[PDB]
A paper describes a structure:
Aromatic residues cluster in the core of folded proteins, where they stabilize the structure through multiple interactions. NMR studies in the 1970s demonstrated that aromatic side chains can undergo ring flips—that is, 180° rotations of the χ2 dihedral angle (Cβ–Cγ axis)—even when engaged in stabilizing interactions in the hydrophobic core. Here we capture ring flipping events of a buried tyrosine residue in the SH3 domain of the JNK-interacting protein 1 (JIP1). Our data therefore suggest that the conformation of the aromatic ring at position 526 is determined by steric interactions dictated by the size of the surrounding amino acids.
We therefore hypothesized that SH3 domains of group 1 have eclipsed conformations, whereas group 2 have staggered conformations. To test our hypothesis, we determined two crystal structures of SH3 domains of the scaffold protein POSH (‘plenty of SH3 domains’), for which the first SH3 domain belongs to group 2 and the fourth SH3 domain belongs to group 1. POSH-SH3-4 shows a similar structure to JIP1-SH3, with an eclipsed conformation of the corresponding phenylalanine residue (F867) stabilized by CH–π interactions from V858 (position 517), K861 (position 520) and G882 (position 541), and by π–π interactions with H834 (position 493).
Author numbering: 826 to 888
Write the structure that this text describes.
Amino acid sequence: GRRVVCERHRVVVSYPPQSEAELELKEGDIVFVHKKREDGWFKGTLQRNGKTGLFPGSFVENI
């Protein structure tokens, strides 16, 4: 019941970052979601490169 801050997701649609605040997503990447924002952007950390940043939530799916 305690907050989930490391929720495992898979990237469904690749996303190129518009700035350094954003994460590059590649299809198939594993991303751990720390926060889902009211504006629909997620904060998470990629397993592949260890980077933390913001990305559009609709581009990922729960595992």
